[PDB]
């Protein structure tokens, strides 16, 4: 009974600071201990610190003391973590997670059952670049898709029909080309008989560049 | 304050896996355990030593004694393949173990499905050309990808990913061949060729057709 939603992915230059927000819906933030956890690529879970908005106090992992700052806003029901003096070692997915404060007092245990969707912060000197998007026309079932070309940095989300179409969808992990840019593809398998009557639109989001492209994918000619 | 769990454990399907986690704070305090499948957020499976959240299968259970907590998984299935993290809570500090990669053995071989898209009209109109070879549902997760232009190998313009785990625990990969529009139009066909477990899987596309 609490939904945590995090701000979008970002690129940041070395030396700068990153702000990640964690907004709670269907629940009051001060009812929870909010914890921030990060994961570098292919690595484990690393605690950054936490906050009890009820008490207003925050505690920090010793590795991050004086570099990370964690606060909360009552009126917006939102928690915040800010990490400064960024280096490439801080490229990671940052997660917020909540546990009911009730149980920390009555039970002396955590139950981090509720997690934000995570936020990829990439630390890089290279400038953001939004993707070009091209339709992969379909020719029983048929595969159709969207090609998402030449963007930096990760990640990119692709939905279909504004999220209405989830079944049959496979978004492939991106290639990292020699040029330093990424490309990925997303494909959905649909009935061939539905083609030409039902519409298929891919919705591409590259949050680091604030690019949002919707591309209609139609049969050939 | 550190927590120690082994880096890896394998289990045959239907067998039981136990992952231990030891450390100072499991004596006085409680262990929680998370499951993390590739590409996903961590999911809590056990809290307060032995409590299972609603929605989590009964084959997951937890126990603890001394400074050692144990996550136990009955009737292991291929979908249970994941990293597992123990976590402690002491003063006002969350501590994580290093994670344990659970491997489920005995998964059957699966040849890869290939989808091959020619360049779109729109990309052609922008004076570029990319062939897209999507490779999915294979196991084991090792392939090599080669391209051909009219029966002859294509060295240049090839960009290939390494395999990655799908949801259904098979693998996916992709490969991209970049061409100029006139290259694309000047050949009778181009082929993506996937080598997997001693066999070769091929799709071809022709500018016409």
Instruction: For B103-114, give the DSSP string.
Output: EE--PPPBPPEE
| Residues 6+ positions from A148 with CB-CB distance below 8 Å | A131, A132, A133, A156, A158, A174, A183, A184, A185, A186, A204
Give CA A75 to chain center in angstroms.
Answer: 24
Q: Which of B6, B32, B85, B120 to mutate to test the interface with A (most CBs of A within 10 A)?
A: B120
Asked whether the beta carbons of residue B159 and residue A178 sit closer than 8 angstroms, the reply is yes
Asked whether the beta carbons of residue B96 and residue A170 sit closer than 8 angstroms, the reply is no
Q: Provide the domain count of chain B.
A: 2
Q: Which of A4, A52, A132, A172 to mutate to test the interface with B (most CBs of B within 10 A)?
A: A172
Residues forming beta bridges with residue B136, ordered by sequence position:
B113
**Same structural domain for residues B111 and B206?**
yes
Chain B positions in Cβ-Cβ contact with residue A112 (cut-off 8 Å): 32, 34, 44, 47, 87
Evaluate whether A32 touches A26 at the Cβ level (below 8 Å). no
Closest residue on chain B to A116 (Cα): B41
Q: What is the CATH number of the domain that holds B72?
A: 2.60.40.10
Chain B positions in Cβ-Cβ contact with residue A35 (cut-off 8 Å): 94
Cα separation, A83 vs A69, whole angstroms: 7
Neighbours of A187 (CB within 10 A): 25
**Same structural domain for residues B196 and B122?**
yes
| Residues 6+ positions from A12 with CB-CB distance below 8 Å | A18, A86, A121, A122, A123, A124
**Same structural domain for residues B96 and B125?**
no
**Same structural domain for residues B77 and B172?**
no
**DSSP assigned state of B7:** S
Cα separation, A143 vs B116, whole angstroms: 10
Neighbours of B65 (CB within 10 A): 10
Determine the length of chain B.
209
Evaluate whether B92 touches A59 at the Cβ level (below 8 Å). yes
Dihedral Cα B96, B34, A45, B83, nearest 10 deg: 110
Residue B139 belongs to what domain range? Answer: 107-209
**Same structural domain for residues B19 and B101?**
yes
Domains annotated on chain A, with CATH: 1-125 (2.60.40.10), 126-221 (2.60.40.10)
Evaluate whether B4 touches B99 at the Cβ level (below 8 Å). no
Chain B positions in Cβ-Cβ contact with residue A136 (cut-off 8 Å): 117, 120, 132
Classified as helix, coil or strand, B179 is: strand
Domain boundary among B82, B106, B130: B106
Residue A204: C-alpha distances to residues A145, A152, A176 (Å): 12, 14, 18
**Same structural domain for residues B113 and B101?**
no
**Same structural domain for residues B101 and B165?**
no
**Same structural domain for residues B16 and B69?**
yes
Cα separation, A148 vs A65, whole angstroms: 39
Neighbours of B39 (CB within 10 A): 11
Domain boundary among B72, B106, B140: B106
| Residues 6+ positions from A221 with CB-CB distance below 8 Å | none
CB-based contact (8 Å) between B141 and chain A? no
| Residues 6+ positions from B44 with CB-CB distance below 8 Å | A111, A112, A113, B32, B33, B34, B53, B56
Determine the length of chain A.
221
Query: What order of strands is seen across the sheet that includes strand A201-206?
Result: A157-160, A201-206, A211-216
| Structure tokens belonging to residue A203 | 């919705």
Residue B102: C-alpha distances to residues A64, B4, B9 (Å): 30, 16, 5
**Same structural domain for residues B80 and B56?**
yes
Evaluate whether A24 touches A78 at the Cβ level (below 8 Å). yes
**Same structural domain for residues B1 and B99?**
yes
Asked whether the beta carbons of residue A37 and residue B94 sit closer than 8 angstroms, the reply is yes
Residues forming beta bridges with residue A215, ordered by sequence position:
A202
Chain B positions in Cβ-Cβ contact with residue A177 (cut-off 8 Å): 159, 176
Domain boundary among B87, B106, B125: B106
* Maximum Cα interatomic distance, chain B, rounded to a whole number of Å: 73
Ramachandran assignment for A190, one of left (phi > 0), alpha (psi -120 to 50 degrees), beta (any other): beta
Closest CA to A181 of A119, A123, A132: A132
**Same structural domain for residues B129 and B89?**
no
Cα separation, A89 vs B99, whole angstroms: 20
């Amino acid at each position: 009974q609490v939904q945590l939603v995090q701000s979008g992915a970002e690129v940041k230059k070395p030396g700068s600071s990153a702000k990640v927000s964690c907004k709670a819906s269907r629940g009051t933030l001060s009812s929870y201990f909010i914890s921030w956890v990060r994961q570098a690529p292919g690595q484990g879970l690393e605690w950054l610190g936490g906050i009890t908005p009820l008490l207003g106090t925050a505690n920090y992992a010793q590795k991050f003391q004086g570099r990370v700052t964690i606060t909360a806003d009552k009126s917006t029901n939102t928690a915040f973590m800010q990490l400064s003096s960024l280096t490439s070692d801080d490229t990671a997915v940052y997660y917020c997670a909540g546990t009911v404060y009730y149980d920390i007092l009555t039970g002396l245990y955590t139950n981090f059952h509720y997690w934000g969707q995570g936020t990829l912060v990439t630390v890089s000197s290279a400038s953001t670049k939004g993707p070009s998007v091209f339709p992969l026309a379909p020719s029983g079932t048929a595969a159709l898709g969207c090609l998402v070309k030449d963007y930096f940095p990760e990640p990119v989300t692709v939905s279909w029909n504004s999220g209405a179409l989830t079944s049959g969808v496979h978004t492939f992990p991106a290639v990292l080309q020699s040029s330093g840019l990424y490309s990925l593809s997303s494909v959905v398998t649909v009935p061939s008989s539905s083609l030409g009557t039902q519409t298929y639109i891919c919705n591409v989001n590259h949050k680091p560049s604030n690019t949002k492209v919707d591309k209609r994918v139609e049969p050939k000619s | 304050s550190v927590l120690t769990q082994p880096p890896s454990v394998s289990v045959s399907p239907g067998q039981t896996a136990s992952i231990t986690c030891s450390g100072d704070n499991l004596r006085d305090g409680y262990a929680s355990w998370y499951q993390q499948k590739p590409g996903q957020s961590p999911v809590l499976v056990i809290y307060r030593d032995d409590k299972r959240p609603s929605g989590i299968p009964e084959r997951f259970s937890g126990s603890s004694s001394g400074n050692t907590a144990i996550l136990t998984l009955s009737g292991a299935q291929a979908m249970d393949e994941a990293d597992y993290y123990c976590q402690a809570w002491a003063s006002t500090t969350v501590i994580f173990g290093g994670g344990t990669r659970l491997t489920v053995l005995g998964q059957p071989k699966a040849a890869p499905s290939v989808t091959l898209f020619p360049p779109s009209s729109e990309e052609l109109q922008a004076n570029k050309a990319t062939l897209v070879c999507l490779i999915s549902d294979f196991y084991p997760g090792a392939v090599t990808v080669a391209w051909k232009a009219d029966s002859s190998p294509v060295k240049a313009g090839v960009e290939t990913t390494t395999p990655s785990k799908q949801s259904n625990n098979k693998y996916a990969a992709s490969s991209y061949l970049s061409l100029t529009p006139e290259q694309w139009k000047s050949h009778r066909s181009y082929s993506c060729q996937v080598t997997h477990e001693g066999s070769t899987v091929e799709k071809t596309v022709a500018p016409t057709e």
